């Protein structure tokens, strides 16, 4: 990835984008839980941004999954 304009409108704020992407990247770095999109030698953080742009990752989704496993 080079620019992050596509991710701005997906999470409108450009800072909540940063923290949400950091949440997903931390999940994908040591919290296992491989990315849902293929990687191209990309770091975990860029994969998080990529999936955010793909729309399949958002703060709501992360919270839903965290709550679901916290019920376990």
């Amino acid at each position: 990835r080079v620019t992050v304009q596509d991710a701005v409108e997906k999470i409108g704020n450009r800072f909540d984008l940063v923290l949400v992407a950091a949440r997903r990247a931390r999940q994908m770095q040591v919290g296992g839980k491989d990315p849902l999109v293929p990687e191209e030698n990309d770091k975990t953080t860029v994969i998080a941004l990529r999936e955010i742009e793909e729309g399949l990752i958002n703060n709501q989704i992360l919270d839903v999954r965290e709550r679901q496993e916290q019920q376990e």
Binding site: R1, V2, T3, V4, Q5, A7, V8, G12, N13, R14, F15, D16, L17, V18, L19, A21, A22, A25, R26, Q29, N41, D42, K43, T44, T45, V46, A48, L49
Partner: protein, 1333 residues
């Protein structure tokens, strides 16, 4: 994990609650062993174990009985670092006063007990017995007594009377006080008081009582009874190189205090005579004061030598003060440095980082990815592998830096772009390469400039460096919307060369194909690069709604132009590149690509333009041979003619026909004329001048001379400098500044002479020194601005107001420069834009004015639209997102959080060093418009203006103002309002000097009250050799005639007294003093008869921001009404204003020398300039109010910055203004405690009115007061910040006594304490944390 901070006076139980146990013995060590004597100053059980996870007894050992209090030695088993925080306390034998509240200067204890500092110190330091409940005696509670008076009091009433001497006496006084009764009585007195100083002191007392009431604090804690003791580590014992332990400097204070207190306990238990124990208490009070802050009350004690020793308070003061510590500067790790080197072949988001520096920055990352991969599992093996330069470590380092943004920071970081962040790509050697295009924001120049490389460690920081700061997400700089990735020096020369029309060259006259065959033609060398030829470019224009509509057609172009067209992305139209792309058209092309196809295509297109510019610049080989600085052949002839001219002028001056000054001015003028001639000649020889065959006859085309090619392209060097290279290099001003009479008559190509060059050195060195000084000047200005702007942060999505300023194109005296386009671009409209056609709403109310809406404004040509402004947004401690507009760094509306104060301050900063340290002729087609119009047909027949502040505008045929000129009073106006005035009319006309007394009607002159010899004099003016009457002022006229005012009760032809048209009173024109009444008595005047012949750099910006009042301010009419010269001759003339709408309450004195533009009696609206001259800002707020001080400050400073070359958007000045005037004086009691004399932050009074009107209460009115940025920074809303501005002890004392809770708001308190800077990621994090609660 820490919301707002609270500070308050500590209760003794609080102090004892801050300890595990009490110290009771002053001892340091055994001096034989390391024995921490029980209850010692470093007691093990009060502070912790000396060695980690140990008991002094040594029973338990190092983990097993962890966190166990040894039953024998009574010591926890924890790490030695626990010793760092375990506070202790020393119980005082007697209450002892706290010096800080005694000597806050003004003392808080003082007004708390409302006693003179002298007597309170007498009682405190044991030389007087205060009276305590004097009761039924001649003495009274507030009274004090010296020793003899106390003895006498004991003699007379020594049965029930009570009086004690010492700190404990002050404590008892504090026990005897009921602040509620004090509140009631002092508010009553404030109601009774009239003396403003009396009200001020009483309100100081009432604010004290308000503090103690609202705050939970109680005044009795002012007198300490338990002194806390810091943990031993924070006061390190620092053992000397011997058996003794060098007990710091504070520990010495503890030694003295503890010894004195133990001896006081001993004396109390033994009950020694009162004199000895009184002396002991005095010594203990002195010792405690010294412990608090030694050197404040008495002479500071010292250490071993005479040199004074510090104190606990010094820990909160000075450079080592732990308030201003994270601000001085931190040598951050993972840093770097290097010299810089150009980096073509890099993309626009890559920074070539050296190998030898990238294996010492990402070292730990290499360790991680190396040990994890198993190449060397143990860490020490990984270290020895990297230091062994083994080939695998290069691969691992490449992997880790695959995507791990680095931050490249230039030295002076004025802009917010000066910490841009790139991806790394590894080169060899040692030089931080750097993409060429991004050399502008940094401002580096590759002549030794050095940039530092930081790295973000934590994953959040990595995502920030890739999202918020990456070099490819900052095409638009903060201040000015247009791009700051703009092709600069060689890329533009390459583009220019690659597209230029040559009349005839190889490949002329043919039709090839689309661009591909054009590049094929050029590479093969068949067709020259410049070849006017038709090709088949196809353009994908966005004519349809978001659709690439493709159209192709045989279009003329140049072969090079077709070649360059391949780099333009799809969306742009072809004509975007068909000119000869300069530095202007190229930036316009790049900006258009931005607006039409978004961001990422602009980055791709900037890369491509830089590359295809460098390549063809090289293949051109544009080189500056000396022979291409052509000199005019007419130069010597023109200079000879100028020399003859000055010769004749000088000879004529020698004959006396022309004075020295006129001769000098004429000489310099003719030198300027000759210089213009030579400049035109050389610019004509350089430009054009290339005559060549076109395959038929000859014709001329724009030349290809490398100097002219550069200058026309705008690569580097405009017409002025090439003029200096070939034409005369001007007239260099002497060191004072006066222009030298004899200019330099030799360009650089020809030689200079010792005299001429020695002259040029003057201007050169003056320029250098002035730049060196303006460096620090701009630095100071930025610091003040960011000091008063850092408070803000965009924290509200919408304040839902309606009071947005109304923006109009700004007219510089007939020279409208900024249309409504810019100064309303993006900023959100407040009211729905209404088309000039009635009832036709153009755009809704709360809508963003992006480029298309601006285009709609242009097509409708709206001359005024109401735009929301941050100068007045209904928010508590921030500023509405909608009310700010676009961020002007990304385009969309500013998202919640992004700090604008430190955006503004820097944008109004960095472009500071660039800052340098009779009749109107209508020129356009339009109609006459007049503002503040009160005119009438004159005797001359044209017109006379009877209004002072009249202004004349030229409304174009579109119904839009274009030109505007301030019409002086008593001006001859040929036409009137509402008459067609095409481009060329000269309607405006007036005397540039003199202040004529025009009589708007006819009537015979009458010297009613103008007695000759007492008020006027029939003086024989020998200029025209005629007798004229001259009015005499108070000094010139007789004192007896002083009352006799020089009135002119004109009488009409019928002889009746001329009443002013529309008034019953006579037209008794009171002429001013020293006026020249040319007309005589019995002369029939006419309309407008003239009777009395009455006669940039940084500092300006700082003055405008610092609200520095002018030295001779223009005086305005504080209230609407008719003016009346009141009492005179009292040093300053007294002037009264009589509101015709109401009473006449307002009057004041004004200097006699300060001339008045208005006569004795004239109906003047408020704001009428009583006198002209420089205009103060603060009075504009006083009268015009907010939304007018804005349109003054923003207009003035943005004019000063538009003066030179820069473009500071108005949002930044507006937020600095908002921060400037966030405090208002209270106008009425309303229903809250707010006294009229009090001044409080405008937010506080705003919310006060909000909550009072929500209920049945009544709000308190206010008047917002302007404060200079230095003044505003001195003013504070957060005690940590004010601590950051020194006077730390005063701030702490005031906050503690007031119980002044402080928001962790604004970006300077959080940095000092160290939490998340609550602006961006920090702000979202904090709001999330609050939400989870």
């Amino acid at each position: 994990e820490f919301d707002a901070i609270k500070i308050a006076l500590a209760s003794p139980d609080m102090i004892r609650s801050w300890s595990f146990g009490e110290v009771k013995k002053p001892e340091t060590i055994n001096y034989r062993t390391f024995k921490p004597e029980r209850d010692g100053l470093f007691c093990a059980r009060i502070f912790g174990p000396v060695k980690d996870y140990e008991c002094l007894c040594g029973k338990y050992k190092r983990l097993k009985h962890r966190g166990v209090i040894c039953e024998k030695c009574g010591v926890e088993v924890t790490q030695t670092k626990v010793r760092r925080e375990r506070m202790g306390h020393i119980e005082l034998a007697s209450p002892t006063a706290h010096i800080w509240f005694l000597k806050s200067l003004p003392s808080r204890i003082g007004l708390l007990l409302d006693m003179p500092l002298r007597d309170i110190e007498r009682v405190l330091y044991f030389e007087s017995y205060v009276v305590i409940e004097g009761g039924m005696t001649n003495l009274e509670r507030q009274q004090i007594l010296t020793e003899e008076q106390y003895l006498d009091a004991l003699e007379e009433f020594g049965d029930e009377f009570d009086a004690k001497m010492g700190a404990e006496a002050i404590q008892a006084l504090l026990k005897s006080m009921d602040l509620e009764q004090e509140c009631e009585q002092l508010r009553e007195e404030l109601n009774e008081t009239n003396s403003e100083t009396k009200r001020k002191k009483l309100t100081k007392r009432i604010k004290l009582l308000e503090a103690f009431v609202q705050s939970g604090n109680k005044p009795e804690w002012m007198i300490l009874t338990v002194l806390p003791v810091l943990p031993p580590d924070l006061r390190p014992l620092v053992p000397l190189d011997g058996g003794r332990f060098a007990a710091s400097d504070l520990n010495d204070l503890y030694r003295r205090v503890i010894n004195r207190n133990n001896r006081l306990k001993r004396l109390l238990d033994l009950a020694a005579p009162d004199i000895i124990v009184r002396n002991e208490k005095r010594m203990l009070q002195e010792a405690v004061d010294a412990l608090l802050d030694n050197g404040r009350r008495g002479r500071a004690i010292t250490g071993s030598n005479k040199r004074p020793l510090k104190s606990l308070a010094d820990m909160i003061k000075g450079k080592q003060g732990r308030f201003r510590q994270n601000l001085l500067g931190k040598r951050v790790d993972y840093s770097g440095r290097s010299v810089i080197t150009v980096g073509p072949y890099l993309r626009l988001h890559q920074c070539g980082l050296p190998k030898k520096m990238a294996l010492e920055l990402f070292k730990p990352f290499i360790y991680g990815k190396l040990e994890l991969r198993g190449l060397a599992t143990t860490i020490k093996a990984a270290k020895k592998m990297v230091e062994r330069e083994e080939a695998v470590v290069w691969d691992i380092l490449d992997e880790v830096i695959r995507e791990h943004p680095v931050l490249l920071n230039r030295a002076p970081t004025l802009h917010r772009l000066g910490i841009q962040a790139f991806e790394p790509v590894l080169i060899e050697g040692k030089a931080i390469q750097l993409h060429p295009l991004v050399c502008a924001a940094y401002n580096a120049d590759f002549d030794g400039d050095q940039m530092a490389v930081h790295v973000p460690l934590t994953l959040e920081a990595q995502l920030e460096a890739r999202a918020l700061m990456m070099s490819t997400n900052n095409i638009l700089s903060p201040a000015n919307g247009e791009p700051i990735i703009v092709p600069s020096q060689d890329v533009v020369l390459g583009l220019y060369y690659m597209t230029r029309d040559c009349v005839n060259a190889k490949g002329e006259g043919m039709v090839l194909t689309g661009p591909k065959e054009a590049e094929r033609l050029y590479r093969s060398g068949l067709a020259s690069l410049h070849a006017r030829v038709k090709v088949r470019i196809t353009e994908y224009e966005k004519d349809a709604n978001g659709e690439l509509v493709a159209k192709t057609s045989l279009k003329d172009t140049t072969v090079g132009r077709a070649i360059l067209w391949m780099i333009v992305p799809k969306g742009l139209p072809y004509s975007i590149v068909n000119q000869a792309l300069g530095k202007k058209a190229i930036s316009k092309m790049l900006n258009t690509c931005y607006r039409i196809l978004g961001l990422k295509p602009t980055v791709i297109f900037a890369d491509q333009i830089m590359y295809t510019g460098f390549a063809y610049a090289a293949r051109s080989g544009a080189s500056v041979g000396i022979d291409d600085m052509v000199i005019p052949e007419k130069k010597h002839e023109i200079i000879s003619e100028a020399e003859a001219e000055v010769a004749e002028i000088q000879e004529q001056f020698q004959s006396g026909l022309v004075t020295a000054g006129e001769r000098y001015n004429k000489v310099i003028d003719i030198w300027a004329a000759a210089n213009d001639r030579v400049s035109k000649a050389m610019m004509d020889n350089l430009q054009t001048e290339t005559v060549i065959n076109r395959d038929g006859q000859e014709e001329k085309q724009v030349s290809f001379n490398s100097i002219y090619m550069m200058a026309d392209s705008g690569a580097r060097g405009s017409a002025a400098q090439i003029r200096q290279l070939a034409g005369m290099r001007g007239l260099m001003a002497k060191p004072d500044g006066s222009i030298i009479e004899t200019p330099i008559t030799a360009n650089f190509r020809e030689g200079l002479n010792v005299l001429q060059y020695f002259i040029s050195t003057h201007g050169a060195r003056k320029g250098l020194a002035d730049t060196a000084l303006k460096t620090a000047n701009s630095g100071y200005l930025t610091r003040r601005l960011v000091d008063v702007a850092q408070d803000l942060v965009v924290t509200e999505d919408d304040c839902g107001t309606h009071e947005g300023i109304m923006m109009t194109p700004v007219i510089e005296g007939g020279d409208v420069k900024e249309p409504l386009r810019d100064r309303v671009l993006g900023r959100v409209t407040a009211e729905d834009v209404l088309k000039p056609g009635t009832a036709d709403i153009l755009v809704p109310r709360n809508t963003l004015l992006h480029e298309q809406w601006c285009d709609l404004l242009e097509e409708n040509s709206v001359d005024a639209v109401k735009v929301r402004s941050v100068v007045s947004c209904d928010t508590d401690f921030g500023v509405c997102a909608h009310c700010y507009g676009r961020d002007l760094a990304r385009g969309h509306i500013i998202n919640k959080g992004e700090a604008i104060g430190v955006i503004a301050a820097q944008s109004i900063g960095e472009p500071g060093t660039q800052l340098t340290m009779s009749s109107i002729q209508v020129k356009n087609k339009g109609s006459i418009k007049l503002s503040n119009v009160k005119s009438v047909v004159n005797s001359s027949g044209k017109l006379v203006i009877t209004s002072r502040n009249t202004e004349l505008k030229l409304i174009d045929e579109f119904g839009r103002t274009k030109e505007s000129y301030k019409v002086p009073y008593g001006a001859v106006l040929a036409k009137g309002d509402g008459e067609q005035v095409a481009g060329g009319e000269t309607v405006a006309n007036w005397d540039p000097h003199t202040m004529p007394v025009i009589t708007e009607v006819s009537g015979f002159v009458r010297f009613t009250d103008m007695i000759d010899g007492q008020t006027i004099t029939r003086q024989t003016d020998e200029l025209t050799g005629l007798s004229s009457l001259v009015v005499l002022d108070s000094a010139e006229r007789t004192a007896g005639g002083k009352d006799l005012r020089p009135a002119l009760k004109i009488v009409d032809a019928q002889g009746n007294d001329v009443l002013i048209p529309g008034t019953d009173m006579p037209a008794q024109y009171f002429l001013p003093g020293k006026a020249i009444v040319q007309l005589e008595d019995g002369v029939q005047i006419s309309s407008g008869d003239t009777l009395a012949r009455i006669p940039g750099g940084l500092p300006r910006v700082a003055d405008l921001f610092e609200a520095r009042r002018p030295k001779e301010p223009a005086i305005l009419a504080e209230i609407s009404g008719i003016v009346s010269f009141g009492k005179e001759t009292k040093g300053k003339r007294r002037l009264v204003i009589t509101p015709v709408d109401g009473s006449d309450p307002y009057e004041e004195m004004i200097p006699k020398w300060r001339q008045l533009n208005v006569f004795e009696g004239e109906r003047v609206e408020r704001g009428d300039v009583i006198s002209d001259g420089p205009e103060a800002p603060h009075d504009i707020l006083r009268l015009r109010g907010v939304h007018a001080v804005t349109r003054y400050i923003v207009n003035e400073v943005q004019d000063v910055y538009r003066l030179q070359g820069v473009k500071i958007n108005d949002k930044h000045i507006e937020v600095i203004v908002r921060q400037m005037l966030r405090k208002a004086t209270i106008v009425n009691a309303g229903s809250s405690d707010f006294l009229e004399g009090e001044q409080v932050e405008y937010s506080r009074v705003k919310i006060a009115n909000r909550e009072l009107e929500a209920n049945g209460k009544v709000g308190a009115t206010y008047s917002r007061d302007l404060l200079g940025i230095t003044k505003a920074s001195l003013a504070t809303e957060s005690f940590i910040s004010a601590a950051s501005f020194q006077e730390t002890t005063r701030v702490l004392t005031e906050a503690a006594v007031a119980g002044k809770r402080d928001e962790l708001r604004g970006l300077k308190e959080n940095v000092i304490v160290g939490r998340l800077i609550p602006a961006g990621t920090g702000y979202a994090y904090h709001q999330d944390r609050m939400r989870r609660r």
